[model samples]
Target: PLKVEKFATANRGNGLRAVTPLRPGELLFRSDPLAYTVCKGSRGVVCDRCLLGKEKLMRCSQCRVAKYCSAKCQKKAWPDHKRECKCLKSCKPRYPPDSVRLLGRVVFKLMDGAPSESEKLYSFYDLESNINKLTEDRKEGLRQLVMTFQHFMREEIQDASQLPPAFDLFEAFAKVICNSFTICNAEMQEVGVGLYPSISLLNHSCDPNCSIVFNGPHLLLRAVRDIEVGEELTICYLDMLMTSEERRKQLRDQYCFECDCFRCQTQDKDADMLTGDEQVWKEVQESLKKIEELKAHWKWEQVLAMCQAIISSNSERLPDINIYQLKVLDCAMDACINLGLLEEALFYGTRTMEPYRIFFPGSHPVRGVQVMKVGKLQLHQGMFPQAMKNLRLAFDIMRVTHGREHSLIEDLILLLEECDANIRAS
Candidate 1:
């Protein structure tokens, strides 16, 4: 149990206290969910999917990351993504895998020769006048760095973002000259695929404490904790753990905030924290770790227990947390299908659809998975066997949502093959 500090209560981390004097390994606070953007798009300043480039605007549902070509498209896409869309959808999905690689190259360019801290940042500004003053001598420098931020996009975030989105044919160097509020808030607007809200909040540190974990459309936050009464939470922004030059360069650049956290202040002898990162993005690594753990302990009983618990909770508002828990339900229940746990399978399987409908209104991915699991369970039922129509409906949903290559399709195939072999052998 973590103690809630009064200040931390409202997200300041003030009320937070170590419960029972936690040790390093003791769980400081374990949330079934840490943090994640269901997508990898970029839409902090605006909606990532709403890129005017796409011939439609994709509006966010539950309020983050939405796109639509017309009111018709927005209405059309709502039913599918609504289940997981939240007010603060991180634009993580828009980033193609290749973009992440390009970003690594751009980062080094932006960090060229380590810009000094205590100087005004290339990205931070207030008022339209300062926008005129951004890197007056080094406008090209700003352009290169801003491009660095965008290169991580599968497609340009804005075909015309070359101009500060605010100013036409007008820009303050390549850096965003919006006010601090706008700079920070813009990153949270739920726009492009790589608009990583959680990633954006990080003020660069050479040697930091917290690390980010990723899931397909979500995330996990892990604390490299130290037990204490009131220690400020910190995570190194520079990826290689820390370096003198890399840390300094990042602090001078994108991380315009003051990082008074302990590590940032502590300097190594004869060295300073420079731009200290090299590719191995910590969040993706963390995502991979949890993925392995889940696959290793795949369970049938617990999945049923979780599904039953939510149904019994009798709450009108399904806890938003249920979205991820239901995915666990989706996966575990699928595992049951693999192991032939029929009745146990039906309970977890059917329970997933209600949340699917509420969260993802139309043609949700989870809804399709739920249908398949249910159909498979019905086929295994000894009495009141599944109707032919019901089984085919399940197969069709699976094919539409997951496509032919999905591993689930293989289970679907096994079901058909087994039924056919049984009839012929008999």
Candidate 2:
């Protein structure tokens, strides 16, 4: 049950508040998406209905674009996929972009009647489109999307008269663009996009008290830190690893709002600021670009070398907390894992923990996942006590963010058990 309530805010408009004291790792509420679609890149790899990844999937016989894990999954998705299937089939070889497909679904639902699954305080119509706040460039992009949508829908319905009389296509696109959530998997990889009206009510904070996680298409909003009664519930809308200026720019450009959160207003920018030498910083940026290309080709040694070079050259000026340094460290950590350098991987992974804690704070899934990765590395390296401690830390955070019954949690439990047995044996 949820201990939160929707209330109006003086500056931020509508926001959720804790009606009762909320503890860390507590589930505040679960929201089912009103409309969603698998990402274009993940269409075949993930089940269209459940969003789960599978090696083998049953493709839709009609459209051949949509795929599912089994007959049951396909059957369950029929109602939602029925209309989309026809549209997809008509398009034939060329499929519409993910956004267009999602926009179409929302339009179809609205044509029927825009009904929400569990939302009561707000409806899809009430979502902020921020159309007035759009920049000239964004306005131009919106125009392009509208044109695309017109052609796509024409192919789908075959008649201009089919759309509802009151339906405003441009407005629908704006609403979706402004409010849709990037649905990600357990590893934080974006696999789909969705619109959850109730979830959209929560406001943004650089240092948030809550985190949103997904079980398939279901969004579970969990408290990442203790919340006092009457406190406003907040979740981060942008990545927390960047500088306040960068964060504000993104928020303004995308969400059309200036963040006045404590973190953004803080005078001390040391945590996010970069004090690196200009020459070294430029070199680091270039290396990062090269590393991306190298990674695609599985050039782990080259990637690792670039990462180490940047870290060694800029270690004094670019603190570990700097976003660039953190990114390089993360890449190096992954490269080490790929190269089977367990000890080196552990070293890189361990170095990230403090900065991750500083940036993410509380029980963030990003921090939790990092800790879990490091713990597994520790376990493999026979560091039983350290592994047990780190695993326990991850468990506390994951139980809240990923939920207790998540497959990741189950795996975490097994790892802890192994750590326990090893400790006992010694």
Candidate 3:
């Protein structure tokens, strides 16, 4: 069972809170994937069984890694599998393919960057209920950006266009997101970013000390500094995620409001997160802070051992177990990756996808992350040909759920590309 933690943040009804200690680069928590099904509407093609081609695939005569509805799809998609099929003839099923699981793997990252005091508002404010912050420049820019994308989204609202033909909406937001993540430089890469109204709603404090981290499926907040009772805990939405111009547009378009944060008020803040001598912050670093610590101090074996010893096999969780679970999930993934148990990693990865859709639905949201998780499992069992097929099917669905540019979508593309390159090389 997931644990729950309560603080003033939860009072807003979205499970948020404030913390202290002022630690800038520390690890917080993680999560595991819940078992679930992938919606089929988004996956128009690809066989559910082997996940490679459509039906009738010549079953691996040896391991029988795949099956087909009609041999034709099997025959057509099997050129690359002839070798792998032979090696995987007798493998047993760990988890049989299900129509419910349209895709096999999905992973989410929280990315690097944190907020400073007096930063602008990160979420919709009192003005959100009205056009309150229109006069604010930063808010105005954000509002316009969202509105422009909003118009595009509305254009595709018809039943005739169940899935927007393209991911242009995210592309439009990407610039705004890049701006938020980068300050003044021209080339910083934006890493992982998420918008939480709970985090956004809190008022800014110059010495405020709350930081949000991704733990498993939930976002975890910890105190970076000690806070006295009634001291407002705040976070920076604009500092690490967008440019000054980009932040302004987002406010103008979505919240129907604007920010009065010190950055906006003084126009002194830079939008992006920084990298070595880079002007604009390079891409947002996904859990970069953790990556550094694990690399420098904690090796995988040490980390995994700590995780195994600490995991609550039988927990009488206190209220904050959700926070604990989040942490556990993160630890599990890192450990699994260290141990080279990607299938396990994939499992937890899929579990995390459910909340992502529920929390951020209607961008044509649905479950598809499971495909890669299961697909990788299939491959690990020496079912490469079968894995290849399973992957193809997952990519088909992902093209709809997250569009082509999503890192996962590219994974499938590269997998196919690599396989193709192999065939030609041989």
Candidate 4:
């Protein structure tokens, strides 16, 4: 049901076009993951299958490698994990890195079971590898990783042991992975990564019209603003809050392309023409650096205190929603929650929602999470009726943005039930 079509561009190659006039809040497209995997850093901390940060998950019996929150999750993953389990059993206690796991899936799909042509916009064949972008040092590192993967796979799956072919597979896999999206949890912390083919057709813009949201592994591409028919639908690949020069450098270093978006055009054109006091910008940068250091230490109270001081002193100079303000409110929200100040947390959490809504609007996973946090605080305060209302709205967004199986949606359902039970008792 995408109101869009795939087309070729003279400058950007493959791009998506708006087929009909689109309004704000309209669903543009959806894609299930062609492949995905939990990051190695998050493996034990989060459920390997559902990406849920849950308590008391059961580990895999045979390999003791993967962990799951429930029997259902374990069962659901068996199709993919059966081969992986055997592979891990052979190389016990030593697992591949997160990137390699995703690479493995791509190899498996291509060698064993490929999706039909209609299922995905394009196959791995059409994907841009950009291998030419990597430095000699980078290419050497990839070659080494590929060798390691080959050794493990050859030891585990004797049948798939064409060493050169497997090596070639991973090199190509590494190239496409730069395009994969980092999947974040309800807290806006990264838990996994996924490759959604249809969504990948989107070209990068510093200022974008649509935002991609994840409902578990399913992705919803929704419009953040209205679009005219025939306009190219775009999504941001990098954080727009960064300086224009920094973003251009990042896109070049990471994705191997120079962005010529309107934002980039304006900023670069006006790069040397700033009239503001340079000292103010320098002070702001120093303060932000200090705030980042405190955030890194997990010193929530210190972060909140420092951020508040910056905001208070520079309130007039601050724009409506700049990165620094967002960080300040983020720290305050977290600090309040950690200190069990529900009412105060709700106040900061509500304000935090404003920036996220503007930056990544319309059913974005982070916004859904922000709404849930406010509802949770309300529930904790025994404001069951109001909690129920906010939670129901969150459920509607999260359910579609994250599938029913996601831990947040599951938690929301339980919370709603608790609210219902409390109402009955009252």
Candidate 5:
């Protein structure tokens, strides 16, 4: 049975509501991208069709651009690639930006007379464009995209009249920009961007009841917590760790909406604030910048030293929950791991747990991965019982977030089994 239904939201236009009570980790719906492209930075590393990463990929012979894991993937992608192959070849040594490539693909889809059947609650055109709400800078950016679109399209279709008559480049660009999803990998690192019309109907919430996960190009929306019938389904559209002010600004700029969600309304200014002393705050920021440079040079000792200095100096003002503290702790944990200081790494990793719990809340992948990291550290240190407890918690969360079939979950299973065997033997 269908778990969700579409309805008019009170103020957020359209929203999805649970048709039945939803269990945490229950799959609400899965969506295939209407149009998607690997981000320019991720082009060669990730497959154009399958969207999976590989150590080496087979690049297209003609364009020397599109890459795939195998011939099967290459063949599967031919229908889409064929449209832009000639243009890509002609534009040699330079390719369009990720957004331009994505917009071009969307245009090709429209030209092919893609389905816009009535049974679906929303079609691609039905998605909000937010063109009117765009600021002057955004409007200028749209104009630039239109200019690029003209140049890109003219490569194949010689006449401007040959283009899809129904298409409005500016409107399409706005729709794609406002509604697109940053397609992230298993670790939640973004690899690409895509548009999913149906999924766009689910509105944003600072404290969302559901979470989105990707398995390559396929997207699954899962309930992060148990949801009551008729409760509107929501997922976060921006980073959850940012301050309410920062989050609001980002949401307004990109999504053109003021968030009145529970988290935004009951804002915790202290959680995101650094020390009240401006000098201390500035020093911490400076140390963080230095830490980044040190990390790049593999100076783990210096990184650890800087992290420790910041944490110790501001321990009172910057509680474990403070974003700055969490950042330093995360950095310290990584530095410790790099320097083979397992005990210290474990300590730092453990400190971040409470903050992660508060920020990530329900079955979030970030929290799941962190728990898994701590469990691995415990396992390596031969804290078998402790490792077993942490790994069990990770398994429960990851089963929902990453799904049981993910490679990380498979590795986690092995660790859990090892932990169990060791505990039994001891």
Candidate 6:
């Protein structure tokens, strides 16, 4: 638990802050989820408990609905799964959609909580729901979904007799459903969703001070840079690489608020597009638009060529926190890797490291995966010592973030062993 102070943001409602000055890469907030569900597509693919990214999992004997990588995971998840298992088995289809499953988890938690535990001790009853702000189309959809949940409840939820009198299904959708965090895998792919109340309180800023690190079912919020005691700790609700207008529109539509952050104020320019250089920024923006079109057409060769031109054209002019350069480098890296251009992979993959290190300075799983990619490239190029070094670095981070049982760690360990065997033979 990070030392945090929840205080009024004056006009901005409530915001979270560090109680003490925090250094870069320091551990900040950590929380067990209030409720979460594995993504609809990831059901049998990833572990239902520890969320280990793998296949060939053990299935629940009775329900055969939930799967796990190990017995430990099965046990850890049993408390939540038992009821959900019974509930699902009662229905014709063995599993509900991720949305309804998440709704069911919250409903069950509320019923189980003693009357004593309030806001201080993980209550989900009164988060900023934006109920009235949701569009009528969405509201109607929620009504229909809630009706489906009522059908499930009649079959399973202890008291099948009293439905409407006991629970307001509309309120359930309005509250937790709106505020749920999209749970992403190590690759930054959306694999599931969760509701962490403390994490949810720290409001959105395009230029945020921290990055989120997922450690199995737990969330570790770490500062990417130094943060002062009084500064409002903010996180980007949308990807920061998008144009400022795009970010604001996304925030307004999903979260129902106009962002007044430093970055948001410059809605005309790109988020990291440098100021005081009109010609350079304009050319960069136009180049980026062209690059997007090439990407749409699947013209990887042209995309790679144009990206390198953009980099050379803006060498001195690129902003300190430029995301476009990183994106171009990323495209080149992926294009080379898929095209079996190992030398180009080595080039662009190495270039990606600096931006990656800056953007996610702390315990970022995505960057950890990139480190492994670099190690693999180094090994292919026969750069022995650097290969071992980066592989080790990636393993250490992935061990804690992805856990010991995940296939990522397994692959890393195998690579490390290969390095050992080859280095000794040489």
TM-score top scorer:
2
lDDT for each residue of candidate 1 in 1-426, tens digit (9 for 90 to 100): 233121232332212233333332222222211111122323332223232324334455455444454565466545333432431243344432322322322222223324322121111222122343344444565555556445443233345443233532233222222211111111111222222322233333344333332222222333344446654434344333233344565554543334554544664421311111212223222333454244333433554444444334454323322333444455556556656776766776767655554443233233445565566666677322352334555565445433443445576667766655554564
Q: Model 4 over residues 131-204: C-alpha lDDT tens digits?
A: 76777766777787777666556644454453325446545655655677888666665678876666778888
Q: Give the total clashing residue pairs for model 5.
A: 0
Residue 420, model 3, lDDT: 49
User: What TM-score does structure 4 among the candidates reach?
Assistant: 0.74
| TM-score to native of every candidate shown | 0.28, 0.86, 0.28, 0.74, 0.84, 0.70
Residue 10 displacement in candidate 1 (angstroms): 18
Tens digits of per-residue lDDT, candidate 6, 87-192, equal: 6767747456677888887666555544422245334655777877888877887888887776665555646333324466787677665477877665454567
Ranking by lDDT: 2, 5, 6, 4, 1, 3
Q: Whole-model lDDT for model 4 versus the true structure?
A: 0.69
Give the C-alpha miss distance for residue 204 in model 6, angstroms: 1.0
TM-score head-to-head 2 vs 6, winner: 2
Error of 1 at 141 (Å): 10
Query: Which model is ahead, 1 or 3, in terms of lDDT?
Result: 1
List, in order, the clash count of every candidate structure: 78, 0, 95, 5, 0, 0
Name the better of 3 and 4 by TM-score: 4
Residues 214-284 of candidate 2: C-alpha lDDT, one tens digit per residue = 77788888888889999999999876667787787888887889887777788346445465665655566
Of the pair 4 and 5, which is ahead by lDDT?
Answer: 5
Candidate 2 at 142: error in angstroms? 1.1
195-258 per-residue lDDT for model 3 (tens digits): 3333334433322355443321233444444444444555444323234455676655543335
Computed on alpha carbons, the lDDT of every model, listed in order, comes to 0.38, 0.81, 0.36, 0.69, 0.81, 0.70
Instruction: List where candidate 1 sits over 4 angstroms from the true fold.
Output: 1-21, 25-204, 257-426
